[PDB]
Amino acid sequence: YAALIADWPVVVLGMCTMFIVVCALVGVLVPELPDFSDPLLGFEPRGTAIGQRLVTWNNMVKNTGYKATLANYPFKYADEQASNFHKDSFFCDVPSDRYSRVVFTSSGGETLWNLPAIKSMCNVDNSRIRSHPQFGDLCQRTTAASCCPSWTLGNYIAILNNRSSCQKIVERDVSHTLKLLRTCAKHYDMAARRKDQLKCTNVPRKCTKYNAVYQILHYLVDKDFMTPKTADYATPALKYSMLFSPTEKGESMMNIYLDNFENWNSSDGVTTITGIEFGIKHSLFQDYLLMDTVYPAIAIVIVLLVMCVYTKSMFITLMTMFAIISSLIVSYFLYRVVFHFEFFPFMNLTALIILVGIGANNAFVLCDVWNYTKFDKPHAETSETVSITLQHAALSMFVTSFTTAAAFYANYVSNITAIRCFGVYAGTAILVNYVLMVTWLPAVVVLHERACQKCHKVLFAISEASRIFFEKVLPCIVIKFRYLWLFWFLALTVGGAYIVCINPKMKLPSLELSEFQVFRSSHPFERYDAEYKKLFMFERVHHGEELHMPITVIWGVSPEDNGNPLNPKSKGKLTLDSSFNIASPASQAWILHFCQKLRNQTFFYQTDEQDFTSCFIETFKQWMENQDCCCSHWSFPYKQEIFELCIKRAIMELERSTGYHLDSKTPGPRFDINDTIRAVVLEFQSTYLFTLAYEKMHQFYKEVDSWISSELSSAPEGLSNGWFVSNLEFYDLQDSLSDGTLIAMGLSVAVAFSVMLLTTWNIIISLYAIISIAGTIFVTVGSLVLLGWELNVLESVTISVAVGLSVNFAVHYGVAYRLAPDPDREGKVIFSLSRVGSAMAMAALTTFVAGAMMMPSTVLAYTQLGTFMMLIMCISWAFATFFFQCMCRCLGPQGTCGQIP
Ligand SMILES: CC(C)CCC[C@@H](C)[C@H]1CC[C@H]2[C@@H]3CC=C4C[C@@H](OC(=O)CCC(=O)O)CC[C@]4(C)[C@H]3CC[C@]12C
Ligand SMILES: CC(C)CCC[C@@H](C)[C@H]1CC[C@H]2[C@@H]3CC=C4C[C@@H](OC(=O)CCC(=O)O)CC[C@]4(C)[C@H]3CC[C@]12C
Ligand SMILES: CC(C)CCC[C@@H](C)[C@H]1CC[C@H]2[C@@H]3CC=C4C[C@@H](OC(=O)CCC(=O)O)CC[C@]4(C)[C@H]3CC[C@]12C
Ligand SMILES: CC(C)CCC[C@@H](C)[C@H]1CC[C@H]2[C@@H]3CC=C4C[C@@H](OC(=O)CCC(=O)O)CC[C@]4(C)[C@H]3CC[C@]12C
Ligand SMILES: CC(C)CCC[C@@H](C)[C@H]1CC[C@H]2[C@@H]3CC=C4C[C@@H](OC(=O)CCC(=O)O)CC[C@]4(C)[C@H]3CC[C@]12C
Ligand SMILES: CC(C)CCC[C@@H](C)[C@H]1CC[C@H]2[C@@H]3CC=C4C[C@@H](OC(=O)CCC(=O)O)CC[C@]4(C)[C@H]3CC[C@]12C
Ligand SMILES: CC(C)CCC[C@@H](C)[C@H]1CC[C@H]2[C@@H]3CC=C4C[C@@H](OC(=O)CCC(=O)O)CC[C@]4(C)[C@H]3CC[C@]12C
Ligand SMILES: CC(C)CCC[C@@H](C)[C@H]1CC[C@H]2[C@@H]3CC=C4C[C@@H](OC(=O)CCC(=O)O)CC[C@]4(C)[C@H]3CC[C@]12C
Ligand SMILES: CC(C)CCC[C@@H](C)[C@H]1CC[C@H]2[C@@H]3CC=C4C[C@@H](OC(=O)CCC(=O)O)CC[C@]4(C)[C@H]3CC[C@]12C
Ligand SMILES: CC(C)CCC[C@@H](C)[C@H]1CC[C@H]2[C@@H]3CC=C4C[C@@H](OC(=O)CCC(=O)O)CC[C@]4(C)[C@H]3CC[C@]12C
Ligand SMILES: CC(C)CCC[C@@H](C)[C@H]1CC[C@H]2[C@@H]3CC=C4C[C@@H](OC(=O)CCC(=O)O)CC[C@]4(C)[C@H]3CC[C@]12C
Ligand SMILES: *[C@@H]1O[C@H](CO)[C@@H](O)[C@H](O)[C@H]1NC(C)=O
Ligand SMILES: *[C@@H]1O[C@H](CO)[C@@H](O)[C@H](O)[C@H]1NC(C)=O
Ligand SMILES: *[C@@H]1O[C@H](CO)[C@@H](O)[C@H](O)[C@H]1NC(C)=O
Ligand SMILES: *[C@@H]1O[C@H](CO)[C@@H](O)[C@H](O)[C@H]1NC(C)=O
């Protein structure tokens, strides 16, 4: 093979170039452009035995009945034969959470009860919001000039006074309202009085305006809550104050934020803006993404310089960077076209950075080996030199790349879709980059055969410095101490294990699915949702608003998920039916007995006022004991000939008599299009309060499912029947994250250990390598959990990639343990050090820098990836070198080897 790369470089160069050009061209032309519109799109498990039920339930809700061509699941249609408002008080409506808002703080002295702060609120509202051309104002009064007031606290100060305006303040109404709140705050024990002209019930005081006090304490500023155990001084300090806006929130608002809020720190010296809610956190996202392609580019540039210092040429560095980019391109082509599945979950974006930190990890090695094979046997042909260097470097480069490739492929086990796609893409990228490192680089190396004094002398100075560093002093500083490092790293390993296994481990996520932190942790959009949603009362009351958890039993459809689950488009499913029957009287009696028994439990909650949300057979039987209509005065289980008609007549009569809305969620039995009772749906109220934690939800699900699983029913409606499905999907996400992470970590560790054992043929060295990998994993994850982290759809992949990146700085030191000198421990170490220390140090430094350049970004994935890469590379290099070399006091010259070659 070596004869090919020799004397024929341009051939393979042109061939690879044409292959890459056609690959890029097809991959750009044929498939469609990715969306990036939704930052979170694949974060839903599939085929987890609960995701199937959630999908089937959401499909059942989708196909509601319609008066005109229901076309599926109508309620009764085939047989159906039909033939506040005042404009006074300057305000439109009570405050709600469907209007845009901001929050002011950061005053001098931490107190805003003063004319400056209120006037600044009014001024910034008039300047940054009203001045922009806007048509979203309510304009309750037909006059556009009186569209709506600014809704500040000064407006309430004014309306509590006789003269009302945003500007004209007397400074006496301020003190009046301060005393008013100081004396009537204890009444908040009360609710909205609706003081149009007076209130009905016995009120605490008859000096209440149109819900003035209740609004100012409930919806507006509520930091202190005005009921603490502080001093009797009627002047307490308030921290944060919220200000609404009459216009609605949504994608329409985004324009305003583009113009006035991006660059401006604070409008006034006395007030600032520390939290904003316009409802555009997930729509603006895409834009910032583009704005943060600066930091990657710079990183790439820096990398080049480093290589241009190590490999003295620039040709090699340029061709290596081209090889990496080419690998990304051809990997995308293999991803979208031949593999045939279509989804680009934006996590693949953060793949680029990773590859830049791993593509060079081999280049150096190759070049290095070449130079060595050039020092020995100087007078030689290119073919034999190429064959020698290939035999010396190919196996090591393949092990180094394939371990990480396997670690990235092992994420094809988890159920989430984003993780699956990211794993497949990154694995293919790494393997293709290895193939290019084996084919493209030898060609360019062979082909490369070709104030100067100052640059040359300083470069030689740097070269001799690096040589004397990695050749003399590092072996001494590593092998002389030899006892501080052992105990130090054992202490660090034990501490990491204690932080991962005993003291607070990686807590499962707590924010809801719709409120994932996507931007930086200091952006206004994120600071609001992190703190001020929890510090204000009008949203804290909704937070855990005593919502009980429902049950749901369905017999019609079958829990069958068929939506191309193999990396789906995350779209497209289908419903279906079954072959049971509910017509037999035995089935009716069994349903009655099932309801009677299910009410005899400890998880069922009782309310005494259920009309129809409970079982329908009970309400139907209650509709009996009547006549003059046909069937009356019979036994309970009927011959179903009358029942087929009575079940329509009764449901029609009841839906006519009561029920303003009974569609798409109510437990009424579901008919087919023409004539039958296809599906039935029962629901009950439980007593578990819908916590957001994991343990309680797990307990509830396990208990209710284990109880309802026992059916022992008639032949019809017994199979495909159980179908307990509550609103538990966040618990599904948490469980899927946990299981996927565990299994992927296990597989990655197994592959790493197997490859490390098969590459050296020595168990004594494999054991030390395993100890080092374990220590690195433990310390890295301990540091990550100390900084404050939690399992998400990124850290779950990072934990698995850490194992793959760990063995890198150990396979090389194990391979470099094959040499001529005999001495067991104090020998055969300086050789490996002086030979591979420079390569390992440079290979770690380049990815350290390429990861550290991501810190100033704004998107959160970039920051997290940067800090993780920095941490893992520092810790892995330190452990590998110091530990692995220092713990070589236990190996001899013929400890152990393999049996048969
Ligand atoms: C598509 C891009 C990204 C890669 C293109 C790769 C090749 C088509 C190019 C890249 C650099 C080129 C080389 C740049 C310089 C030279 C030296 C040139 O000879 C001289 O400069 C004369 C003096 C001497 O040889 O001493 C002969 C062509 C050659 C080998 C070129 C051959 C074609 C090469 C390998
Ligand atoms: C240094 C070399 C070897 C690699 C460079 C990698 C990146 C820094 C490059 C590759 C893709 C480039 C992007 C390709 C396309 C676009 C869209 C382009 O969009 C517009 O010009 C929008 C305005 C308009 O179209 O009128 C702006 C530059 C940008 C983000 C480019 C920015 C620079 C990127 C990220
Ligand atoms: C150690 C390494 C070399 C092992 C192989 C790793 C990857 C090359 C493999 C692992 C799992 C594979 C995937 C497993 C299953 C599928 C579904 C498969 O579906 C079909 O073939 C559908 C055919 C049709 O109906 O048209 C397409 C390839 C794909 C994505 C595979 C692509 C190649 C993958 C990523
Ligand atoms: C992997 C990173 C570290 C390097 C840079 C690559 C990406 C960050 C670049 C390459 C392609 C770029 C995209 C190319 C085209 C578009 C479409 C563009 O669409 C619109 O402006 C409107 C679309 C519509 O609504 O129809 C928005 C920016 C976006 C997503 C760009 C965002 C930035 C992207 C993803
Ligand atoms: C799909 C295409 C474009 C690329 C496929 C990759 C092959 C071109 C690579 C993959 C692994 C390579 C092999 C890896 C290692 C060796 C051992 C090497 O052994 C020697 O020359 C021994 C020299 C000595 O005695 O020191 C000979 C080349 C060879 C077979 C390599 C030949 C090129 C191979 C087959
Ligand atoms: C290889 C090393 C780095 C560990 C990698 C995994 C850990 C970083 C994470 C992933 C899954 C996590 C677990 C996911 C779920 C749970 C159950 C959770 O259970 C409860 O809260 C109590 C009720 C119960 O025991 O189920 C306690 C934390 C724990 C063990 C977590 C502990 C930390 C784990 C093992
Ligand atoms: C190279 C290898 C050796 C690295 C380490 C891999 C495993 C040996 C680690 C990774 C995750 C660890 C687990 C993380 C969390 C737990 C839960 C812990 O139990 C609880 O937290 C129970 C809490 C409760 O009572 O609700 C017991 C240890 C265990 C199983 C740990 C056992 C050791 C595990 C499997
Ligand atoms: C022989 C020497 C050169 C070895 C050096 C390697 C370790 C001793 C270093 C490298 C990574 C360092 C860690 C990187 C990050 C952190 C997290 C950091 O966390 C916090 O500061 C938590 C509190 C907070 O900031 O809110 C505490 C220090 C620590 C554990 C560092 C401790 C020292 C570590 C383990
Ligand atoms: C051995 C030689 C060749 C290199 C040694 C490099 C270190 C001495 C320096 C150079 C780059 C430095 C980093 C450059 C940028 C940052 C980001 C910086 O970020 C913040 O302060 C976070 C701000 C926030 O919380 O928003 C923290 C320090 C850090 C990691 C620096 C840590 C110290 C580093 C690694
Ligand atoms: C070995 C030779 C060839 C290269 C050595 C490079 C380092 C000496 C320098 C050059 C570029 C530096 C980086 C340039 C920019 C930044 C971003 C900077 O970001 C912040 O300070 C974060 C601010 C924030 O929190 O918003 C942190 C230091 C860092 C990583 C620097 C760390 C030190 C680096 C890598
Ligand atoms: C000089 C080099 C060769 C050896 C010593 C390196 C340490 C001084 C570096 C390595 C990792 C660094 C840490 C990497 C990341 C962070 C997170 C950073 O906080 C953020 O930017 C936000 C993090 C987040 O949001 O998750 C604060 C600095 C810190 C602890 C860095 C502190 C300095 C550390 C320990
Ligand atoms: C203040 O109150 C008096 C009597 O209650 C009323 O006549 C007067 O109009 C009020 N002030 C203003 C500016 O309306
Ligand atoms: C914000 O920066 C501007 C100049 O860019 C400055 O005039 C203003 O005083 C700053 N804000 C504060 C609160 O000082
Ligand atoms: C359920 O309620 C009480 C005991 O909880 C009992 O009198 C009644 O008979 C029970 N019903 C059934 C069907 O067991
Ligand atoms: C509608 O129901 C009638 C019942 O007799 C049946 O004959 C017919 O095939 C049904 N049509 C469809 C499209 O299911």
Author numbering: 181 to 263, 285 to 389, 400 to 661, 687 to 865, 873 to 1144
What does the paper say about this structure?
The membrane protein Dispatched (Disp), which belongs to the RND family of small molecule transporters, is essential for Hedgehog (Hh) signaling, by catalyzing the extracellular release of palmitate- and cholesterol-modified Hh ligands from producing cells. Also uniquely among RND proteins, Disp activity requires Furin-mediated cleavage at a conserved site in its first large extracellular domain (ECD1), yielding a mature Disp protein consisting of two non-covalently associated fragments.
Ultimately, a triple-point mutant (hereafter hDisp1NNN) in which three conserved aspartate residues located in transmembrane helices TM4 and TM10 (Asp572, Asp573, and Asp1051) are mutated to asparagine, showed sufficient expression and was well behaved biochemically after purification in detergent; this Disp1 mutant is known to bind Shh stronger than WT Disp1. To this end, we replaced the region in hDisp1 recognized by Furin (residues 263–280) with a cleavage site for the highly specific 3C protease, and we purified to homogeneity the resulting hDisp1NNN-3C protein. Notably, the hDisp1NNN-3C preparation was devoid of the low molecular weight species found in purified hDisp1NNN, indicating that Furin cleavage had been successfully abolished. We solved the structure of uncleaved hDisp1NNN-3C at overall resolution of 3.61 Å, and the structure of hDisp1NNN-3C-cleaved at 3.68 Å. The two ECDs of hDisp1NNN-3C are held together through a helix-swapped configuration, with each ECD accepting secondary structure elements from the other ECD, involving helix α1 of ECD1 and helices α1 and α2 of ECD2. A connecting loop between residues 263–285 in ECD1 (named the C-loop, for protease cleavage) is not well-resolved in our reconstruction, indicating its flexibility; we speculate that this permits its accessibility to Furin or 3C protease cleavage. While the absence of density for the C-loop creates the appearance of a large cavity between the two ECDs, it is important to emphasize that the C-loop, though unstructured, still occupies this space in uncleaved hDisp1NNN-3C (see below). The resolved C-loop is moved away from ECD2 in hDisp1NNN-3C-cleaved, suggesting that the uncleaved C-loop perhaps restricts the motions of the two ECDs, and that proteolytic cleavage allows them to move away from each other. Consistent with this model, extra density was observed at the C-loop position between the two ECDs in the EM map of uncleaved hDisp1NNN-3C at a low contour level, but no extra density was observed at the same position in the map of hDisp1NNN-3C-cleaved at the same or even lower contour level.
